[PDB]
Every structure is written in C-alpha cells, then in structure tokens.
Design an enzyme around this catalytic site. Structure first.
Site, PDB file in Angstrom:
ATOM      1  CG  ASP D   9      -0.123  -0.031   2.573  1.00 48.91           C
ATOM      2  OD1 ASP D   9       1.050  -0.507   2.613  1.00 48.91           O
ATOM      3  OD2 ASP D   9      -0.677   0.454   3.567  1.00 48.91           O
ATOM      4  CG  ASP D  14       4.173   0.112   1.226  1.00 49.81           C
ATOM      5  OD1 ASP D  14       3.584  -0.967   1.357  1.00 49.81           O
ATOM      6  OD2 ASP D  14       4.028   1.035   2.037  1.00 49.81           O
ATOM      7  CB  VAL D 115       4.898  -4.727   3.071  1.00 53.60           C
ATOM      8  CG1 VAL D 115       5.929  -5.859   3.108  1.00 53.60           C
ATOM      9  CG2 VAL D 115       4.804  -4.118   1.682  1.00 53.60           C
ATOM     10  CD  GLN D 218      10.551   9.336  13.056  1.00 49.61           C
ATOM     11  OE1 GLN D 218       9.359   9.055  13.174  1.00 49.61           O
ATOM     12  NE2 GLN D 218      11.473   8.934  13.932  1.00 49.61           N
ATOM     13  CG  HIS D 230       8.269   0.077   9.418  1.00 53.42           C
ATOM     14  ND1 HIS D 230       8.396  -0.178  10.768  1.00 53.42           N
ATOM     15  CD2 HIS D 230       8.119   1.416   9.299  1.00 53.42           C
ATOM     16  CE1 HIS D 230       8.305   0.956  11.438  1.00 53.42           C
ATOM     17  NE2 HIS D 230       8.144   1.939  10.570  1.00 53.42           N
ATOM     18  CG  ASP D 231       6.335  -1.863   4.289  1.00 52.79           C
ATOM     19  OD1 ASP D 231       6.123  -2.116   5.501  1.00 52.79           O
ATOM     20  OD2 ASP D 231       5.545  -1.175   3.606  1.00 52.79           O
TER      21      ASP D 231
HETATM   22  N1  LIG Z   1       3.559   5.477  11.404  1.00 56.94           N
HETATM   23  C1  LIG Z   1       3.404   4.551  10.397  1.00 56.94           C
HETATM   24  C2  LIG Z   1       2.117   4.080  10.093  1.00 56.94           C
HETATM   25  C3  LIG Z   1       1.927   3.153   9.078  1.00 56.94           C
HETATM   26  C4  LIG Z   1       3.035   2.696   8.376  1.00 56.94           C
HETATM   27  C5  LIG Z   1       2.814   1.677   7.329  1.00 56.94           C
HETATM   28  N2  LIG Z   1       2.418   0.501   8.072  1.00 56.94           N
HETATM   29  C6  LIG Z   1       3.551  -0.341   8.397  1.00 56.94           C
HETATM   30  C7  LIG Z   1       4.207   0.006   9.766  1.00 56.94           C
HETATM   31  O1  LIG Z   1       3.201  -0.036  10.790  1.00 56.94           O
HETATM   32  C8  LIG Z   1       4.415  -0.146   7.145  1.00 56.94           C
HETATM   33  O2  LIG Z   1       3.940  -1.065   6.130  1.00 56.94           O
HETATM   34  C9  LIG Z   1       4.147   1.283   6.664  1.00 56.94           C
HETATM   35  O3  LIG Z   1       4.061   1.400   5.219  1.00 56.94           O
HETATM   36  C10 LIG Z   1       4.326   3.129   8.676  1.00 56.94           C
HETATM   37  C11 LIG Z   1       4.508   4.063   9.683  1.00 56.94           C
HETATM   38  N3  LIG Z   1       5.764   4.486   9.951  1.00 56.94           N
HETATM   39 CA   LIG Z   2       3.135  -0.650   3.770  1.00 54.12          CA
END
Ligand SMILES: Nc1ccc([C@@H]2N[C@H](CO)[C@@H](O)[C@H]2O)cc1N
Ligand SMILES: [Ca+2]
Ligand SMILES: Nc1ccc([C@@H]2N[C@H](CO)[C@@H](O)[C@H]2O)cc1N
Ligand SMILES: Nc1ccc([C@@H]2N[C@H](CO)[C@@H](O)[C@H]2O)cc1N
Ligand SMILES: Nc1ccc([C@@H]2N[C@H](CO)[C@@H](O)[C@H]2O)cc1N
Ligand SMILES: [Ca+2]
Ligand SMILES: [Ca+2]
Ligand SMILES: [Ca+2]
Lengths: 292, 303, 303, 301
Positions: D9, D14, D115, D218, D230-231
């Site tokens: 998404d 991503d 992801v 940040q 993260h992803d």
């Molecule tokens: N705050 C925040 C909210 C949502 C996301 C999205 N959700 C996952 C991490 O929870 C990752 O897939 C981010 O793309 C990322 C962040 N950093």
């Molecule tokens: Ca994501």
C-alpha cells in the site's frame, strides 16, 4: 409462610412489591435490603424508608451497594414521585446489607428465599464474599432480564444492564432461579380501572398505590411477590440462561435458550405468562390488609 | 514512615514482602489483609499466619475475599505448589486471623484516617475492588496504591496477562478506573529481580529467622526453575526508596474482553491515545540497591 | 418484473425459492449464485444444478465463496443431511456452473445495470460482502436486498443467532452496514411458514416435476422433524409485499465472540434513536403465500 | 531465486521494498498487487505506479481491495520524490484474481510478501482455499509482540483489517512476521541516506528523496535523528534470512472490539502449549541490512 429478604431499589414498582411482601400471610418478610439502581443509593434508601414509614411497616431496612461491582454506574426527581411523605423519622440499620444477607443466610436452616427486584449488586457481592451462603439459599426470585426485547437497550433489561457482572455471578451460582423478565412483566398493565379498583379499597396502601400509579403501564417487581404467594398464577419455562457481559450491542442481555438448542441443563424458571385477574385480586388483598 | 495495608495471597514472594514490610523503619505496617489467589483463601490465610508466627510479626491479619468478583476462580498451582508456600517447615500454627472481614477492615481504616495510608496489593485485586465499590468515600482517603501486577509486554499466565490481574480482571478494571494514584510493578520490572544462588547465600549468611525463611523459600522456587524473580517485595522496595525504581507515567486500561487478552493491562507507553496518565509503571530496578534492602530487612529479625 | 440475482446454498428451502423465482412472471431471474452454507460449496453447487436440471430452468448458475470471510466454517448437516438436499433422487448431472466466479458475476452485472436489480441472499452473506468490499461502486447500483436470515427474537443455531448470519457474522456486518435498502425475512416471520403433511399432499396433487420435487424434498425435513419454508418468503415478498407485514428497525449485527455471536440486534422500539436500516418481517399471510407457491408449481406441469 | 508476489500500500517504505524486490538477483518479482492502507486505493495505486515508472520497473501492477473485509476503513501519501506525468497503468485483472490464478498455476514455489493490510491475502484465501498449499511461505510486515503504533496494542497493517489478519494467521501457511519490535530497530540515519544518495542512480535518488522527508518529519515531530524502514525488511529476509533472528511462536490475532482490537498476541514463552505458527522477527543486523539496501540501489545503475 415463605421467608424472604427483599432486595430493591425504590423505585415506584419496588414500593408496590414492599407493600405486598410486608402484608401477605403467605410471606414472612425478614428484612428489606437496598441497592443503587433506579436512582443513587442515598435516594433509593430514602424512598424505601418513606414507603415503610407511610405504611407503618416495621421490618428492618439495610443500605447496601451504592455502586455496581465493576461498570460505570447508570441510573433510570426523588425516584418515587407521586405520594407525599411525612418528615422521615425512621432510618436504616447500621449493618451493611451485604453483611446482613450473609449473616442471616449462614444462621438459617436453608429455608430463606432472596427476592432481588433491582440490580443484582448486593446479591453478587454476598455470594463471592461468602460462597457458603449458596446452599443456604432456597431460591432466588428476581425481577430482571428479557428473553425477547429489553427496555434500556434492545438487548437488555435495566436491572441486568445496571450491573451485568453481578448478574453473571447470580446466573452462574447454581442456586435455583426464577426470572420475572420483561416478557412476563410487560403483561401486567395497570389501567385507570385497576387504579380505581385499589382506590375504592382505600387505606394507607390504597392511597399509596393510587398516588404511585397515577404518576406512572406495567408493574414489574410485584410479580415476584405474586409468584411466591401462588406460583400457579404465573407460567414459567425452564431454560438455560446465560448473561452476556461483552461490551457492545448485547451487554447485559439474558440469553435464554428457549428451544434447548445448546443441550445444557436449565438453570432458571423463566416467566412466560401471568393471569392478570389473579394478580390484581392479590394486589387488592394486600391493599385491604393495611386498613385499620 | 509510610503507613500501609499489605493485601496479599501468600505465596512465596508475598512472604518476602511481609518480611520486608513488617521490619523496615520507613514502613508502618498497619495490617495484613489476605485474598484468594496463588491458592484458595483457606491456604493463603494459613500461609500468611505461618509467616507472621515464624517471624514473630504481631500485626493483625484479616481474611478477605475467597473468590474473584465475577470470573470463575483460578489458582496458580503451577509455581507455588500444594500449600502455596512450600520449602520452610512451620511449627503448629497457634496464631489466628482477626474476626473482622478484610474488606470491612480496609474501609473502616481508610475512613477513619487522614488520607495518609497507602494500599499495597500484591495478589488479585478482589479485596480492593470490593472495598472501593462498597464504600466509594474511601477513594480520596487512599494516598496511593502500589500494586504488584500487570505487564506492559508479555504476561505470565497467558501471553497477554499477568496472574494477579488475570485472576480477577473485573476487580483490576475497578482499581484502574478509580482515579486513585497508582504505581504498577508489572512483570517487565519484577522479572529483573532474579534471585541467584548467591543472593540466597547472602541471606542465609546474614541468618536469623528471616534469613532462614528467605533461604528455605527461594531454594525451593529455584529448584522448580532448574526443572527466579521476587515480585511482590519490589512494592515494599519502592515505598522505602522510590529512586531505586524507574517508573514511566502511562494511561493504563484493563482489558475485560473474554478472548486472547482477557486480564491484559494495556499500557499506552507512547501516549498515542492522548489520554492523561493514570499509573506510574515500573520500567527498571537497581538490583544492587534492592538486594541491599532485602538484607537490611533480614537483619532486623536477628534475635 | 423485478430483476433479481438469487444467492443461495441449496438446501431444501433454497430449492423451493429457485422453483418460485424462475417461474413467476413478476420476477426476472437473471442468475443464480451459490455460496457454501447448508453444506460445503461442492455439495450446494451440485444441489443447485440438480434442481435447475430437473425443473429445466435454463438460468446461468455461478459458484461463489466456498468459505466465510473470516470465521471457521460451519455447516448445517443436522437438518439437510449428508448431501445437503437429501430426499429427491436426480438423473445423472449434465449441466454445469459457469466459469465466472459468482462474486465477479455479481459485481459485473450490477456495474453494467441501471440500478434496478435486487439481490436475494438466502444463504450466508459471504458472496454479497465480498462483492461489496471488492467493488464499493456496486452499492448505489443495488435497488434493494431481500435476505432470509436473522431473528429479532430467538435464533435457531444458537438461542441468539439464525444459521445464515451465524455462518458468516462478519459478512452479515458488512451487509447490515452497507446503507443499501434491506428487507430481512428473519425466523420470527419464516417460522410462521411450516410445511406440514397436508401441505406436501396439496403440492404433490398439483404434481409434475416441481410437485414431485417439493414432496421428495419436504418429506425428508419432516422425517428429521420427528423431533417452515424460509427462503421462499423472499420471493413471495418480491411478488407481492402486501402479503408480508414488515416493520422498519435499526438492526446491528453482533460479531462479538460469545453467547450472541451472529445475533441480529433489532431495535424494535427505537430506543437507540438511530435511523432504521432494515424492513424486518413481522407476519405473513400464509393463505396468500401457499396460493403463490401453487401458482409457481403449476407453472412446471408437462404437456 | 525466490519467486514472490509483493502486496503493498505505497507508502514511503513500500516504495523501498519495491525498489529492493525488483532488482535483487535473489528475488524473482512476479507481480505487484496493491491494497488500500496508508491511503485509499486510488492513491496507493498511483503511488505504486509512480515508483515503478521512475525506477523503470516493468513488473505488472494489479489493483486489489479498496476496503478491508469487514471494518470501517482507516487510513494512515508518498512525499519527497517528484514524479514525471504518470503513463504506466494497472493491469485489468483484479489483484485477488491475479493472486489466485498465479498460485493455482504454480508448483508451490511462490512466496507472498504482504507489507500492507492483509485484505487481498484474506480474500484470495477464502475465495480459493486450494491456494493454501501452493503458498510456500508468507513474509509479512505487520504486528508487534510488544507495543503497537496506531494503538498501544496494534500495529497499523493489522489494525487496518483485523479480520483479514485473523484469516492469514489461522491459514496454516508458514508465516514470517516482521513486526514493529524488529522494524523499529531498522533506523535510517543521515549516514545511511548518504550511502544510498552517493551510490546514485534512480533508486539512490528515490531512497534519498523519500528518507530525507521521513527524517525531516521525525525531527520536527519528536527529533529523533532517524526513522525506521519497515517493509523492506521482508525483502532483506528473503535475500538472506541469516541477517534477521526470528523466534517460532504461536500467534493469535485479537478481533475483539476494545483496547486490543488488531493485536497480534504472540506466545513468546510458549505458555499456551500450542504449536508455533509464525517465525517472529526479534533482531536485525543493520550493517548487513544497509549493505543490502546499497546493493539493491546499485542494481539500478
Ligand atoms: N507510522 C506509520 C504508520 C503506518 C506505516 C505503514 N504501516 C507499516 C508500519 O506499521 C508499514 O507497512 C508502513 O508502510 C508506517 C509508519 N511508519
Ligand atoms: Ca506498507
Ligand atoms: N424504564 C424503566 C427503568 C427502570 C425500571 C426498573 N427496572 C425494572 C424493569 O426494567 C423494574 O424493577 C423497575 O423498577 C423500569 C422501567 N420501566
Ligand atoms: N507463576 C506465578 C504466578 C503467580 C505469582 C504471583 N502473582 C504475581 C506474579 O504474577 C506475584 O504476586 C506472585 O505472588 C507468581 C508466579 N511466579
Ligand atoms: N436448522 C436449519 C439450519 C439452516 C437452515 C438454512 N438456513 C436458513 C434458516 O435459518 C434457511 O435459509 C435454510 O436454508 C434451515 C434450518 N432449518
Ligand atoms: Ca426495582
Ligand atoms: Ca502475590
Ligand atoms: Ca438457504
């Protein structure tokens, strides 16, 4: 005579239940215990005491739980408008209702019936504080619940909704239960002519009933006293009943297995229908008992 | 001196908490109240009385709730064994509980006080919740509640829940919604207070009744670990010197949903809910400080 | 003519609904979509195709969801038997499902329409919910949803829940929060439509292919009723809504695990003060209904 | 080469996961499927397509679920980079159908890499349960055994569709969970951005444009001189699992409305006595990880 402790939150219909319980020769009213419900405990206590003073009922009154066992308190002016009372001279006993219930049951030979017609807070606290009371309780005849539609929500009747966790304790106690739910009590519609019937009987009780029901329709709580006087007047069906304590749209629902689909032993005699001619006759019998 | 009422379900680590509370000059132990938890109330009561007799602690002991406020009762026969306090051998019990129910004792004592008493619950919160709902006027009379229970991370009895909370989640909901200042020594903190063979040796070597008691108790529990943390005593440590324990203010909610998080303390560590903090949650403990205190308390019993 | 897509899990009473829908001049049956419910999808599909073949119904049949959207699958093998349509013996099956998935068929058909199509789900709501969430643009295209499911009073599968909703509560939550006009033929209404020995005798007198099918089908459910026609009420409703009294209510689906999982919570008295979202079936004129059933069955007798 | 379908998404991180997946010789990226999450599906699709166009990634892109399977939709949408007018488009096949058809036609060697919220995966699994044995493994970014992000209890991807996550976590397919506990360790500092920026090429500029924005918001919000990626950890895991320590746990998704809705309840100590269903991410070698990110960036030169 059925020995009872009447646990109540007066409350218009509680007052009618007190009137009936204190007078009928088939009932030995040992004590009245008060719980928060219809209004806060300060008010329901004053209401209960006002009724007892006006009717010259000399039974001891005990104040109990001012709050439900877990949930944020809900309520339903005075909590008993209509009749005007004398300056309050009589008072609650110094013993907490929960202690009174425990002590009285523990010292008994198991012949006492509990009659809760408010939220089940006093009863649940007594049960968990002293589980040895469970086999001492002959039966519990409560006003509360609904197998169909509730009143406070679509799912829940007020007494249960006001303390669902307390209701869960009672409905899992294993003590024989009789449930006068809304399905039954909504049938006891007091009409102008029922009020007129009681007025003509007169006396302290007649005026009180008139004053109360003029302001107020179903009488709910009094059906429990009717049931103990003559169970034949009320058809019950044995059901396995579970209290839903889930937050959400059925919080405080009494889930009643009407068709026995869960294959669980019944735990409650659930009120189905009431002979209202029988019931009103009984109400008048109790009313006429107060004429001097 | 901090006036406390110690509410407990002995329980091996409860006994350590009793030992500490009854002896340290920074604590005025007013009474010990007993709740069902680790074992049934009949057993936790005998366990508490056994400890007080052996240590010659003359503080009144009050039996309280034998059952949780709503749920079906659970015990911890996992870690605490048959009695719920195995290891030491006790002389025949001559000491007894007061005739007053613990819930009435808590209410009366708080109502009569000037608001300077702290509650120290180290078992399920059943006594506390009943007292609170039976007499809500006690709420402003409670200075603070320093409880052992909960976990912001992983529980013990389930992944989600610590035993004290899990044993009475509805009671815990009452406490955590009371508005009284709370301090929570959860598993995240208490798991750090691991008692090693040498901590036991340190207490045996100090000796006396309390050194022997600590030793018999902890040598038993460490045997079950081979096949260990002291939890409850951290609440007493905290009241003696709060500087030994780092806390963080958090909004904490108790989950009472039946399901995988029943009895979880949901702790808003990052403040994402935007709700005012209601709990000082235990984060870290100086264990050198803590064992020093335990030894200090043990030596108080040297007769 | 009301254009409909009939979504079903045959199923004894589903078969009766198919029979009615495919024949009555007030109904334009565009397609039959099949969902898992009464039995697994392999079986309900074969059952649906068996019915269509025997009645020479030439409407396309689409296979849809073999599983509910979230929960662990349940079946109703108690009432419906091993096959899901025990009773009638069918010739070897030569007819088959279309290659298009039911969910895609529902989306494509609605998207290409002018908004005059009604969905008639008489099984679990799995196909409907997936279609809705996969292509939300279908929502304003759906004229109405006339479903068999739910109960404002007592359920059947549990005290709280009717089978169709219980089999996929999360799908039902999607449908009941869609904002599409809903008509709910719940158990309170459908239980008024029992098929007794005299009803079977009457239909089979009318005889032919649909007569013999009604009788073979309804005799098995009476043989398990040593201990109602539900789905066909939805078709009755579309033919003449005057035969069925409804009441507008705000209905919410309970998806809490526990004693009311899959309950349709119907605000009969309007106490929540929320706008009605459903026309809930209250009573049915059974003389009218059986007359209609006969009108439909007669439509199948051979030359 | 591990064959994967990357379900996403986009979403800043991503985009980084796309960058890594599409280039590395250890990965065979079969297709990209898009789900609503970070933003609504119209936007995440455009974001995904922008990333592919800018990086000249020619893998087919499929639009999937615009909504979660049951709950009311929540959102959390790719600032930093500037994109040329979009000419690439999504395929006509719905992502759910693509996933089903591709798995059914395979010999069981494909891995799914979700992801975002798990909506596409759950719908595909319940629509065609025969795909389950065809899925070699699911390496997902989502969940947290400790503290969540969107609520104290829940990580965004799971919170955004808890019922879909319940489906995945009860599927019986081998799961790998890069939850927040792991990914919050993957802190991108100025030196990490420098490394990618100075390597250069389209992927180095994209990383740098994206992460500079992430770092700026940040520092302004909590500063905080770095921010997690993260992803992309899921792609790191598939390139070399040795870089990431996992622990086998029985994981359950809480779907109760209330304070733990969308929580991954992870039985870290095995107290429930249930067989593990998930390899849960515990620690990552970040020196290894940033080395791999740079290697991927360099693949676009
Ligand atoms: N705050 C925040 C909210 C949502 C996301 C999205 N959700 C996952 C991490 O929870 C990752 O897939 C981010 O793309 C990322 C962040 N950093
Ligand atoms: Ca994501
Ligand atoms: N509205 C309302 C609110 C509260 C009550 C009280 N609760 C029980 C029936 O629900 C009876 O015991 C009434 O006293 C009754 C009514 N009718
Ligand atoms: N397993 C176990 C279960 C219960 C306890 C008791 N509950 C708290 C920690 O969860 C402490 O108060 C222990 O007395 C301790 C242990 N070790
Ligand atoms: N027990 C039972 C279980 C399932 C069904 C099926 N579910 C709906 C009624 O609840 C109808 O659509 C029946 O096809 C019917 C019955 N009688
Ligand atoms: Ca009442
Ligand atoms: Ca303890
Ligand atoms: Ca059906």
């Amino acid at each position: 005579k059925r020995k009872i402790i009447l646990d109540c939150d007066p409350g218009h219909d509680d007052a009618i239940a007190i009137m009936m319980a204190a007078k009928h020769p088939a009932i030995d009213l040992l004590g009245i215990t008060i719980v928060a419900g219809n209004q806060t405990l300060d008010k329901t206590l004053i209401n209960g005491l006002n009724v007892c003073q006006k009717l010259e009922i000399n039974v001891p009154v005990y104040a109990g739980m001012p709050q439900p066992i877990m949930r944020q308190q809900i309520v339903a002016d005075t909590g008993l408008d209509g009749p005007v009372f004398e300056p309050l001279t009589r008072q609650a006993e110094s013993t907490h209702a929960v202690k009174y219930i425990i002590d009285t049951l523990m010292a008994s030979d198991g012949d006492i019936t509990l009659v809760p017609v408010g939220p089940l807070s006093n009863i649940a606290v007594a049960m968990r504080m002293q589980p040895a009371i469970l086999p001492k309780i002959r039966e519990i005849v409560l006003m509360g619940g609904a197998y169909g539609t509730g009143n406070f929500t679509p799912s829940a009747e007020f007494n249960i909704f006001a303390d669902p966790e307390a209701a869960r304790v009672v409905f899992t106690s294993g003590v024989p239960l009789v449930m006068m739910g809304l399905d039954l009590t909504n049938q006891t519609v007091c009409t102008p002519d029922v009020i007129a019937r009681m007025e003509r009987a007169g006396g302290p009780a007649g005026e009180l009933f008139s004053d109360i029901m003029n302001f107020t329709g179903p009488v709910h709580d009094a059906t429990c006293i009717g049931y103990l006087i003559n169970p034949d007047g009320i058809k019950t069906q044995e059901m396995y009943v579970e209290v839903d304590v889930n937050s959400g749209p059925c919080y405080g629902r009494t889930v009643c297995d009407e068709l026995g689909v869960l294959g669980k032993p019944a735990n409650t005699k659930v009120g189905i229908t009431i002979d209202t001619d029988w019931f009103w006759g009984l109400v008048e019998e109790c009313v006429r008992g107060y004429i001097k």
